[model samples]
Target chain A: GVDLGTENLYFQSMVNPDLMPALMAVFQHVWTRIQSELDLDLTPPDVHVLKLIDEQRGLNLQDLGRQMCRDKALITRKIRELEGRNLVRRERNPSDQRSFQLFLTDEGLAIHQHAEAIMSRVHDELFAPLTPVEQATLVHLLDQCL
Target chain B: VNPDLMPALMAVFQHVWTRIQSELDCQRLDLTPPDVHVLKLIDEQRGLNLQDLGRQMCRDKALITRKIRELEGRNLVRRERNPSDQRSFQLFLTDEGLAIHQHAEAIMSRVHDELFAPLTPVEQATLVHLLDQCL
Candidate 1:
């Protein structure tokens, strides 16, 4: 009985193709604002990497790749690019000399913090038109998907 | 502003998009996501012209033209003479294009169902309501 009701609503809401366009607009709105606010040559993926590293400061290449659901080679390349910009550094794991842990440099942390600020502000501004209860309800509903 | 909200939203969105792309590619249809999108729009609005389609899709004319060319080459869509405006051409989906549009819509529906299967009907309704606010 529960599953039937769930499936019913799922099909009803899911069949509407207009949903993706709205979601994509939200997606583009976030990325566009981030790009405009920050002067970095970072794409959305690059910014994603920055925030991921900031969240888990000492994560290694392999784990970072796993967490990001990205290919190892691509993760390596992203780290190399960030390293080149002096934004991220790899330190030898004390327990395992063969493994390296990734951490943000001061500049990296600065950029990540700045980006987070911009992201937070943009998110706030986007939802400001809605009531506080609606904002909380939206977040809860999305968290359900997660 | 839950600190985790944006990250979770992006992750799920990216996951859904990646799944859709992979499903489309696996079908070997040779249509990118945007191409399939244009096909669907043209299918729904049968006589849309290039300018109007570009505006609705929020894409540049050149990009729209390229996608149309690709679709036209595949014989999924065609540009016909506009009766009112001789200068602009109206877009229509061929039989094959309608078939492909139906198939693509099925794929997207399946993906959405599977992705949101965890949520109940009430939750789905609420999610749709909240998303509508953003739009």
Candidate 2:
């Protein structure tokens, strides 16, 4: 049985000190590569939003927020940021007039693909220390934890 | 190589990362995640200059300076004149700073253990090996 208590969750999950540098390195590598390769001014959160939208077109803000497990205000803000860049468009949901459904623009789709490619490249580079079997094992283990 | 896997992993990682930071804040630790990282860096690389620390962390020099000041305010670190470089001050963690760093280390270790508890010994070892390689 899973306890789900904070202490229990954290106690076993205590992050190793040595792992901190690696974690930060992975994040920084992705962030830098995305900017340099895609020339997009998107932050980590921004790209997450893009990926969610790309996976499911015409999702209302509330749904996107729920899927992302982020707050409504934050989700709205991110959508607006993307919209400002013409990466996403908000339209009134036919089923619900009060809300807006988000769809990626053509440019948005292209940008998302590019961003994804860069992410894949970065992941490959970062994970290169592991062999194919080891890479699969790592991903599998992470998935279990997640 | 699974397309959906990386995105899912990142979402989980961000969620966990934010939760840890907020938990510290909620407990009035008065430290951010990056601040903890900076503390650890100073401990590992004692007497390193602000410029070099920023370069190592891939952070801005100004931001690193601000973090140093925050640590100084808490008596966690002290800045002394750099004999090698007159323009930049060298940083060293104080006793209080080392204590705080140890506490932070404990917390993170607990968090990591909890996160990885589901894995077996072999799996955990493999994960660590892969992480080292990636790092």
Candidate 3:
């Protein structure tokens, strides 16, 4: 009853553009509020940087820059701004004097918590529509498609 | 002894797949997978130069330039010069850009969980471990 092929998957990904934007609009409605509630100036980009640091702490400047997919100078500027705000702190790595390890400060940790909490709540709310059984069935199907 | 076959694993993964397609189609979202992937890369970088961004995103230079310009004009991103690099310009998300990233993250999370809800923790872990080997 089905004719599945790589071409079919490729076509859907290439031909469809609206699918992603529609997905984004629905998500931002909640995340922006959490950013605001924290009374911190954060864009999605900033949250992303913070999330990376949260996931992997003490990464050196260049390595951090690489992981973030940013140029060294740009990463430096963001780190400086975060440092000044006390969201992040910089320490020279004794292992390599040329490099510095970027760490999240107490403030950064607190902000990370808020963001995580809001995200968790958002996840629960989004999934509330599906019963556990329905959710289970749906998950199984997706694994096959990939 | 023959190993036990869990063909049900196949069936379960399929229904979950259908649900994801159904939900995404219901919303009529306009993003290509590449667009979402690139957007998320920018979201992660916060402030990244366009050239470096292209490398991270694995998109063509011209393509990234066009997207960056479009995003800039819409005020979704701000383009600033990199003082240290004469040839590079940095991109940062505006308030609107952040809003978009958050929204995308939420939708993705929903999609991810919905697509994986069927398997038991042990099955999920086993599947994920097996899946990672291929990637």
Candidate 4:
């Protein structure tokens, strides 16, 4: 019941979805410095949700839901929580009254910027074993598998 | 069956399935990857009706609903009646649900790192790019 198909394994599961890996990198990247950098409780999912908004700013709840493979209602709630923290803000879509666009606040941007740098370090640690050509080829081969 | 395809499939499944196991191992969580997948998917997509949830995950409706109920009893998720769609409820993750997701993702990432470590960066790129074609 749990097994994904061979094709799914090759495509979605094993290879392409780097969000988790990217997230892990950020967590690992930040864990050591979090105590020194700032003081607050930020879980990985919160970070992931925040980063998704940061990376894809101006996306509506529906779109964000689709990207996260989640439902719109949960997206709405999480957005509100983030808003409460002043990490993100909501604005009327102008065209759609039913939905709003969420954007990261300045405080959000600061955290995101810091996360980005740590993310780069994580990527470096992750890929340091491979040569530049190997990196390119890995991406190339992964692309081909799909 | 193409012999080449089978090895490729086996190698790939071994990587993913094993990693999923290890992730579950680290968290001491009883849910399988598919179970976890179903829960996470629903949590993220709050307004999804059963059929819509199943379709997105490529699962059957009954199976999806069954899994959701199981999660509900565990208190990881809750179903709120959707007024617009009386037949369905929006799925929301509890704080416990959110924690489970973060832990699951973190464990999977570590496992994935090990799995991909065997290959070169170029190979990783090639593998992912090839995988993308299917999508």
**Which prediction has the highest lDDT against the true structure?**
1
Worst 10 residues of 2 chain B by lDDT: B19-28
Higher-DockQ candidate of 2 and 4: 2
- Candidate number of the best DockQ: 2
**What does TM-score give for chain A of every model?**
0.85, 0.81, 0.75, 0.65
Ranking by lDDT: 1, 2, 4, 3
A1-146 per-residue lDDT for model 4 (tens digits): 22321113333334335533442333333444432355555644466677778878788888876655445776688788888889989888778757688899999988877765654454455445556665555444433332
- Backbone N/Cα/C clashes per model: 0, 16, 27, 37
- For every candidate, give the share of true A-B contacts it also has: 0.29, 0.34, 0.00, 0.04
The list of candidate 1 runs beyond 4 A from truth reads: A1-25, A28-121, A131-133
- Tens digits of per-residue lDDT, candidate 2, A18-124, equal 44455566677777777778753565667767778888878788888776655687679888888899999988888864877889999989988998888778876
- Classify candidate 1 by CAPRI docking class: acceptable
Interface RMSD of 1: 7.5
Ranking by TM-score: 2, 1, 4, 3
Cα-based TM-score, every candidate: 0.64, 0.67, 0.46, 0.47
Q: Candidate 4, residue B83: CA error in Å?
A: 0.8
TM-score of 1: 0.64
lDDT of 4 at A56: 85
lDDT string for model 1 (A17-123, tens) is 44456677787677667766776467555677887888886888888887665558768998999999999999988888588999999998998898888878887
**DockQ of candidate 4 compared with the true complex:** 0.05
Q: What is candidate 3's lDDT per residue for B71-132, written digit by digit as tens?
A: 77767778888899868888888777666555555555566554544544555554443333
